[PDB]
Design a protein around this ligand. Structure first.
Ligand code: B12
Ligand code: B12
Ligand SMILES: C[C@H](O)CC(=O)SCCNC(=O)CCNC(=O)[C@H](O)C(C)(C)COP(=O)(O)OP(=O)(O)OC[C@H]1O[C@@H](n2cnc3c(N)ncnc32)[C@H](O)[C@@H]1OP(=O)(O)O
Ligand SMILES: C[C@H](O)CC(=O)SCCNC(=O)CCNC(=O)[C@H](O)C(C)(C)COP(=O)(O)OP(=O)(O)OC[C@H]1O[C@@H](n2cnc3c(N)ncnc32)[C@H](O)[C@@H]1OP(=O)(O)O
Ligand SMILES: C[C@H]1O[C@@H](n2cnc3c(N)ncnc32)[C@H](O)[C@@H]1O
Ligand SMILES: C[C@H]1O[C@@H](n2cnc3c(N)ncnc32)[C@H](O)[C@@H]1O
Lengths: 557, 131, 557, 131
């Protein structure tokens, strides 16, 4: 206890007085809009918060940044020493196309590379597969071969800038290509900073990018994790993600708790190999959204850091402090942005970027004002970077660590999130674990319920959406520059894939694929070394993916 | 006098399903018989289901930007099987001119992002009554 | 004391440990950008703030909203019951022109009217005076006669919407016109909600709109205050302003303290008439900027409310709680906005609007993205309103009162501002008062020093200004719609002024002007009743202003 | 070899002086003899001072948007008094085409918002040397 009980009593007595005197008189003059107000994530909120409301939370649970339980930040110096990475997503056409956008984004002030891939690549298909028709380089960049990655990362010093890949069931193939590229370039692998999203549990739950059944797919994540721990010192093998859970329609509580449920499953799978938690936990990372409820999102980020620290220390027995410090990439909520009055998205994204900064994010993507129309233009991305640069350089928020620390409301909400998160994590365990609940569609049903209640709240006008159900305009003069699809992308991409297959040693590649099946047949062996040899030898993602479908099959809901 | 039989579909590599699951729940709750194709279906798989299941309406949710390739393929298969009288509707996200180009192909309704679920219920009952 | 000294000791011991362990190790890896960081207002900031930093501030000084010293807000229900007024400035051409913009702004969601006047009107001249040439209806609306105000407020229910006038040395004339209009319309005067800026002390200090010497000009403010207290129950006779002090180049401390210095002078002048503080203090109001330092601006607003409460209670002996509750209009900092990359102003204004809301503002004007070019377009004002509407309806910040309350940083900074403000207020008194220091140019010299240091910091690049000294672009395709000046404004305006003078009873108006000199010659008499009769009779502002120059003279620096 | 004599002016009802006070301090500190006209001066008052005070440069700070009315009046008075060889510069805020239109009238420099004070010092020394 930090609050003197003689003062806690005074506070509680004084508020009860104020509720009947000042509050009672004003509610007569003009009542409040709602009998009970709630956050967007459905947590009930008080009219005001005092020190009495946080008296039950010990000051140790707040503490100091870069010190356990890291509520105030994973680093003790945060933005006074190093700003968050301004890392904007880029992805369309061929490697060359996205490489041009990387260069533009870097010239505009981005400090980290983020790459989004097309559907064939995300789904494990080569550009010429029948399932790929009309989808090559459309929603992101096309990667079939290591040759395409060379085009993608042309003139990019991989040892001097970090490179993120938004790749999931076929993440191991892209990581093998990255390693093969780094070797070809004569780089030190332990100097390569980067990330592959890789988190498959959230794919079954929310993003819907999967190739194989749950079990072999988790083993791949495990192989990515174990390989990176032993071979790539500065590499982040996963981003255990909440973003997609939120964007699929979840509440901030479902986002936070379901991501932590996935973390537990992963740690158990990796430690099962005999790898001690402290060999890999320091390098684990997360990915969260910065949604519309300004204070709730900050409370959620601080609660996640505290919950994560407690789980790693208490449940996993971690002894390295870095194993308990949560590091996360953040993206502003794309689901809050509108097609009508699109420039108003600049305001929405400003507030959401600020919540991420106040929340202590390590990396940030700000969405473009053109979010509800198409993949972004250069101008839209430029505006998203200026947004970050204004917060970083003009607002002053970067100079004081965890400035919201101590806030009666933020502290009470941080504590409410923590308890509600643990309560969910407990039910998941009681109900038989993550995998079983994913198989029962339990997570997905909860997400779907929130998504539907959100849709009904938008319809009734109970949830205000400016331009949609509030201040609606009949805009006839909508002028918007849209990023176009280059119709030569498929022809251009297949040409290279066909060439790579023609130029390669077919016999050696086919033999190496047969070796891969043997490595995959042994659950204890790592898939990474041979996939690195395969991509080098001229194997395509499709060659690798298809060969493994023969022993593992495919997943369907 | 049987309930309105709706097939809600997902075509191609598109894994966006938040909107389609919202529409599905909206129609089931409105008293309709709703069939969901599931993710990653081909236009031929989708057309076959619409016919085999003898649906009144085929609802395609698109967010992958493939509408101009998908819709001509769907109609080509529907014409082949004498199923041109099937009400084909679309939803999701696409440019205004894409919405226009698919209506010109034979799509009866295009109800995109922010369409309140009641408007979807109403349009379907309206399209079924018109025929 | 609220913090248990056994815990305060622990906190201070733990931080000293953290400064040498975690902090010491990280500063080796990567040092901080600065040896000592400061707010924009030059207050030094710590790396982080703990409960120990605020232990010396009693919890009574934080307390509850709508309860003394009102640090947390002047009302106990704030935005859960009534949102701040979204009150956008409008002013150009003739009354009819600005009336069209009022209607547009109302249709876009503005909840209060704000009016900016042209230079002739601000300076006390009629549109046809030689000093007015080329300035009629250019920088704001032209008001010469009550006839123009009828055009200005045509089809506007003055009893159903509040009307603000950004009028200063000639504020009494515009207030007389407003009263005359309300009477003509058959409205109850005690139901008229509105404001005249009127604060002349800040005009000598910063805005530079003056007609007469300091002494007779303060007497007019006093007459506005005393008349309103006895005749206009729902009217705000003044907005004691800090905005212009800041915009003239002051620090947030100079802004806060110099505005409070002006308040003291005004209260002394009004109470000198035998009017008790509680007869007028409840109706006094302020006007502050929301500058670029996100947290400093919030701390400043809370400090101002606390300082104001303490002054009114302790120094003036106020007994009515409303006399101690500071109510304020806020405008985002126009001086932070740029001509290069102008759309980026949307981001700047979003953060500044949020600081005002978190700061507990009663009324807010958000600037247009076109601030550095010209008076705003409809689209620019529409975007400024959407900004406010997103914060109010989508962010959730409106549902919890003083959400930053308790924040170790905001609380410590609020307390630092309070002490530094009192320290300045003390020097002003020691140096002989406001008027004497205005006559010595003391306030103005301090403002000018900050303004010059800001210019030098922008030049060196020590103060980052995106688009100006950071991420500078050679934009060749600048497309911006600019609000145009109608060249028929002067002709149209003089036509009406000439007509009003022609149609009136010249003999009766001239006699009433001679009566006004006699009323002005008696410092104890109020100028308001006769100015109401004058404007009604067809007198122009120039007729009234010129007549009084004959007995008072004019001011010059 | 006397220091550069600058008259910094304010013309019309314009009460904006933050920029003009910044320029004034910048030039005084650079070693120039600086005269400030004060607020609310007429073009005739301003021209008379420039001549009476025998300044090298007449610097007009404008933020009221009157530049196109003020500048023709200033030149008309300067031509009358045989003072056309006086270096006339402008600063403040105005559209690009206004900056252009005044240069066409005879204004030698237009250094608007965000101009660093060193650039103002440099341009003045440069204009005085050129003549
Ligand atoms: C949420 C979201 C996601 C979530 C999806 C979660 C899920 N499981 O559904 C996540 C984060 C996982 C995601 C991933 C991706 N996304 Co996404 N996503 C969005 C976003 C922000 C909102 C879509 C949404 O769910 N809205 C809310 C729901 C309720 O609305 P809805 O789908 O529009 O449905 C409504 C109406 O359309 C209608 N309706 C819908 N279907 C039907 C059907 C019929 C017949 C009828 C009558 C009515 C109807 O009623 C609904 C209720 O009002 C949009 C932008 C946008 N504004 O659309 C981008 C967007 C669709 N995504 C996009 C992209 C590119 C991707 C990725 C390919 C990125 C990448 N390269 O990795 C991946 C693809 C993943 C995959 N497996 O396919 C692009 C598409 C580009 C284009 N089409 O031009 C968009 C536009 C964003 C952008 N600007 O880049 N995304
Ligand atoms: C600060 C400010 C104010 C302050 C002024 C404080 C003061 N005492 O100076 C306050 C809040 C009081 C104010 C009031 C008004 N303002 Co004002 N204000 C501004 C603002 C935001 C910044 C100007 C500023 O000081 N910038 C910082 C200084 C350091 O820069 P500067 O003046 O540009 O000077 C630099 C350069 O120009 C150059 N320089 C300047 N002079 C000279 C001279 C020479 C010869 C040279 C070589 C160089 C040089 O060097 C300087 C240093 O870099 C501008 C918008 C803008 N971006 O300009 C509007 C603006 C100038 N104001 C405007 C208006 C309309 C008004 C009012 C008329 C509103 C009303 N109706 O009541 C009043 C007028 C008051 C009066 N008495 O005249 C408009 C003008 C419209 C137009 N011209 O098209 C603007 C553009 C805002 C808008 N979009 O509406 N304002
Ligand atoms: C479909 C939709 O589009 C949604 C999607 O799926 S798009 C998804 C896109 N995904 C991404 O962008 C993910 C990005 N993720 C990352 O970058 C990482 O995995 C991450 C979360 C760990 C953050 O990493 P990164 O940005 O490099 O920041 P971070 O690791 O904090 O900083 C880099 C270095 O600076 C150091 N550092 C940072 N702050 C410091 C400080 N204050 N003092 C001293 N050092 C500091 C770090 O220790 C690190 O050093 P190391 O490389 O030697 O370990
Ligand atoms: C040159 C540059 O452009 C700079 C310039 O100079 S431009 C300057 C432009 N100036 C302005 O816009 C000034 C505007 N000022 C004002 O509106 C006032 O003087 C003000 C500061 C007091 C704010 O007033 P206003 O907007 O009406 O808000 P406020 O008085 O709080 O609310 C109106 C009513 O609702 C009530 N209210 C507000 N919140 C409430 C709540 N939470 N519960 C119950 N009642 C509430 C108030 O008591 C008041 O009632 P009353 O009329 O019976 O007293
Ligand atoms: C769902 C998320 O996908 C992102 N997104 C998807 N593809 C791209 C791309 N190719 N370029 C930039 N952003 C993209 C959008 O920013 C959205 O926020
Ligand atoms: C100095 C402040 O003056 C305001 N400003 C001045 N005149 C007008 C007007 N006529 N219309 C709208 N805003 C105006 C700008 O918004 C700036 O912020």
């Amino acid at each position: 206890t930090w609050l003197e009980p003689q003062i806690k009593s005074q506070l509680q007595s004084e508020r009860k007085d104020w509720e009947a005197n000042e509050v009672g008189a004003f509610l007569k003059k003009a009542p409040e809009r709602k009998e009970q107000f709630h956050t967007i994530g459905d947590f009930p909120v008080q009219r005001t918060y005092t020190a009495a409301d946080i008296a039950d939370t010990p000051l140790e649970d707040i503490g100091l940044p870069g010190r356990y339980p890291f509520t105030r930040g994973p680093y003790p110096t945060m933005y006074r020493s190093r700003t968050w990475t301004m890392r904007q997503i880029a992805g369309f056409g061929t490697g060359e196309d996205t490489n041009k956008r990387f260069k533009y984004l870097i010239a505009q002030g981005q400090t980290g590379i983020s790459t989004d891939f097309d559907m064939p690549t995300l789904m494990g298909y080569d550009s010429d597969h029948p399932m790929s028709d009309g989808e090559v380089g459309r929603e992101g960049v096309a990667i079939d071969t290591l040759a395409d990655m060379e085009a993608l990362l042309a003139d990019i010093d991989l040892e001097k800038i970090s490179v993120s890949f938004t790749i999931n069931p076929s993440a191991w193939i892209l990581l093998a290509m990255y390693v093969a590229l780094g070797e070809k370039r004569g780089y030190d692998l332990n100097k390569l900073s980067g990330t592959v999203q890789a988190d498959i549990l959230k794919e079954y739950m929310a993003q819907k990018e999967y190739i194989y059944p749950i079990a072999p797919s988790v083993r791949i994540v495990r192989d990515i994790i174990t390989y990176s721990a032993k071979n790539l010192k500065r590499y982040n093998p996963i981003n255990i993600s909440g973003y997609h859970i939120s964007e699929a329609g979840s509440s901030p509580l479902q986002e936070a708790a379901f991501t932590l449920a996935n973390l537990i499953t992963y740690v158990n799978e990796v430690t099962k190999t005999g790898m001690h938690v402290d060999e890999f936990a320091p390098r684990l990372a997360f990915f969260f959204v910065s949604q519309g409820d300004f204070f709730e999102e900050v409370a959620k980020f601080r609660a996640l850091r505290r919950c994560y620290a407690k789980i790693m220390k208490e449940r996993f027995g971690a002894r390295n402090p870095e194993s308990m410090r949560l590091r996360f990439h953040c993206q502003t909520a794309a689901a809050t942005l509108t097609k009508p009055q699109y420039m108003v998205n600049v305001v929405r994204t400003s507030l959401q970027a600020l919540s991420a900064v106040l929340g202590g994010a390590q990396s940030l993507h700000t969405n473009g004002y053109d979010e509800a129309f198409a993949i972004p233009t250069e101008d839209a991305m430029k505006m998203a970077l200026r947004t970050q640069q204004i917060i970083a350089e003009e607002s002053g928020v970067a100079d004081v660590i965890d400035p919201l620390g101590g806030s009666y409301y933020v502290e009470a909400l941080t504590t409410e999130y923590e308890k509600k998160i643990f309560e969910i994590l407990e039910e998941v365990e009681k109900r038989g674990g993550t995998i079983k609940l994913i198989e029962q569609g339990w997570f997905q049903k909860q997400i779907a319920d929130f998504a539907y209640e959100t849709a009904l709240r938008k319809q009734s006008g109970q949830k205000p959406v400016i331009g949609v159900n509030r201040f609606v305009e009949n805009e006839e003069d909508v002028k918007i520059e849209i990023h176009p699809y280059d119709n030569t992308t498929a022809e251009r991409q297949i040409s290279r894939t066909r060439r790579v297959r023609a130029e390669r040693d077919e016999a050696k590649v086919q033999a190496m694929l047969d070796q891969l099946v043997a490595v995959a047949k042994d659950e204890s062996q790592n898939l990474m070394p041979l996939t690195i040899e395969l991509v080098k030898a001229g194997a395509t993602m499709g060659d690798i993916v298809e060969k493994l479908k023969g022993i593992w099959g495919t997943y369907r809901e | 006098q049987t309930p309105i039989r709706v097939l809600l579909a997902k075509v191609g590599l598109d894994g966006h399903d938040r909107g389609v699951k919202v529409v599905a729940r909206a129609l089931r709750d409105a008293g309709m018989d709703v069939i969901y194709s599931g993710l990653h279906r081909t236009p031929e798989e989708v057309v076959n289901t619409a016919i085999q299941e003898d649906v009144d309406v085929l609802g395609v949710s698109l967010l992958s930007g493939v509408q101009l390739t998908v819709f001509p393929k769907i109609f080509k298969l529907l014409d082949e099987r004498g199923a041109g009288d099937l009400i084909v509707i679309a939803g999701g996200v696409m440019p205004d001119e894409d919405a226009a180009a698919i209506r010109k192909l034979g799509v009866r309704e295009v109800l995109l992002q922010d369409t309140p679920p009641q408007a979807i219920i109403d349009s379907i009952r309206s399209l079924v009554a018109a025929r």
